[PDB]
């Protein structure tokens, strides 16, 4: 109580947890410990990996199989390899996920419950957490064959909208529009895989668009009425069409499988929030094909 105050009055604001959403800063959470500086050591000896397994580039660089096509000696040339009305012959170039399956269950004899199940690859799984993306898409195309199979597969890139055939609950490619006549790949960037010289090829497609970043919505909730975010998430597509029909002695199979791996490089994401109308959610296989799944909402209170 010796000298009186000489300190000025300071302005206040009652804002607990100011910016708790940020990744860097000082947290005000009280540690339920003994030492104010409680702290563990490094990850050395905790995990075997010699590389940071949580780096965006490492996670998105993890390869995954998206397609396993069937190429017959019967398939016609300059025609995207048929895979039903789904993707693979035609592959949307982009980090977001483009393929989904619909799980339909009964409820009453007057209604069914359709749930979208998306088989995400590591990079597609990551892109789902952000609003926009930008990256170099990588694809590895393998032809599981024998030394007796011959023929030539063509893979070209076409920038822009993807010719599609929307469905009441999904979106697929418009193969009829991607045949050698209506869709000449003479000027397009491409690669011709010759089963006589190679079995594999890794195609890297750098980011090309009139936009700085593309949306990450992908196939989520895409159908006849809602297919715009889908187109705003890819920039183009790859097309796998035979240049030379598949040849095969009868000592071997008249088939060959085409495996397609997907992953990204030079990845950069923008915003810290899903672009979808719902929260990011992991599909969890119910015990039975009839058991119901949990449905999350975006309701506050």
């Amino acid at each position: 109580s010796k000298p009186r105050n000489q300190q000025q009055v300071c302005p206040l604001q009652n804002v607990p947890a100011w910016g708790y959403s940020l990744y860097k800063g000082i947290d005000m959470s009280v540690p339920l410990a003994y030492d104010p500086n409680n702290e563990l050591g490094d990850l050395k000896d905790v995990f075997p990996s010699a590389v940071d397994e949580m780096a965006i580039g490492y996670v998105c660089g993890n390869p995954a199989v998206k397609h396993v096509l069937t190429w017959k000696t019967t398939d016609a040339i300059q025609k995207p390899i048929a895979n039903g009305d789904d993707w693979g012959g035609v592959i949307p170039v982009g980090m977001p996920c483009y393929s989904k399956s619909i799980r339909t269950i009964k409820i009453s004899e007057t209604e069914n419950r359709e749930t979208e199940v998306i088989d995400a690859a590591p990079c597609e799984y990551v892109a789902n957490m952000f609003s926009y993306w930008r990256a170099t898409m990588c694809y590895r195309i393998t032809v599981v064959k024998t030394a007796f199979h011959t023929g030539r597969l063509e893979i070209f890139f076409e920038p822009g909208v993807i010719p599609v055939k929307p469905t009441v609950n999904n979106i697929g490619p418009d193969q009829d529009q991607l045949t050698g006549a209506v869709a000449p790949s003479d000027n397009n960037y491409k690669y011709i895989l010759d089963l006589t010289n190679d079995t594999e090829v890794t195609i890297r497609v750098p980011f090309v668009s009139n936009k700085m970043f593309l949306k990450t919505a992908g196939i989520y909730g895409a159908n006849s009425e809602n297919n715009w975010n889908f187109h705003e998430s890819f920039s183009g597509f790859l097309c796998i069409r035979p240049v030379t029909k598949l040849m095969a002695p009868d000592t071997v199979s008249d088939n060959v499988s085409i495996v397609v791996w997907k992953w990204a490089e030079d990845v950069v994401v923008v915003e810290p929030k899903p672009l979808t109308s719902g929260p990011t959610q992991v599909y969890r296989p119910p015990p039975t094909a009839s058991a119901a799944v949990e449905v999350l909402n975006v309701e506050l209170q």
Partner: protein
Amino acid sequence: DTHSIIQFLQRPVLIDNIEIIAGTTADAAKPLSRYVLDQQNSQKYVRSWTLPSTVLKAGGKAQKLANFKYLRCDVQVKLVLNANPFVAGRMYLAYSPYDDKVDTARSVLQTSRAGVTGYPGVELDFQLDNSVEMTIPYASFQEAYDLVTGTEDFVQLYLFPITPVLGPKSESESSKVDISVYMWLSNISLVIPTYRMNPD
């Protein structure tokens, strides 16, 4: 290859030829209105051009960059005047980025004469200038113009009459002026191929 194409895109082409008649009768000489109280009384112009599609259509330039996806460029404009010593008058050539893609009130045609004359432009006096040039910097908000989609014109060009076209009094004879509008591209950036192309 691409270079020869870019050179061809920089070739000036007569985009239009406007004839101004001293007879101050049609909305041909309608001079900028001092005010604009309603949209029914928008600003009248002698001629307008939606760029860059307008120039990509002349001189056969569109067929030059066929099978190309993205374009980036500045539009070059030049007006060659050909008037007689008896017709006086002055006009204003201005441009407005996305003039038709924004709130109506923010359009150049929805503002006062003072406003319109405030836009980026150049003056043209019939008895002083033989020609006037102007450059329109890439005005798109996108990294590039989609050549195949062709629905992305990012700038509108307008030719407004500041003052009425003054000619000698007569009904038996008309005084003419007329003009030659030339356009071409500069700072061209052409990239990425595609099998599809803007139907036109």
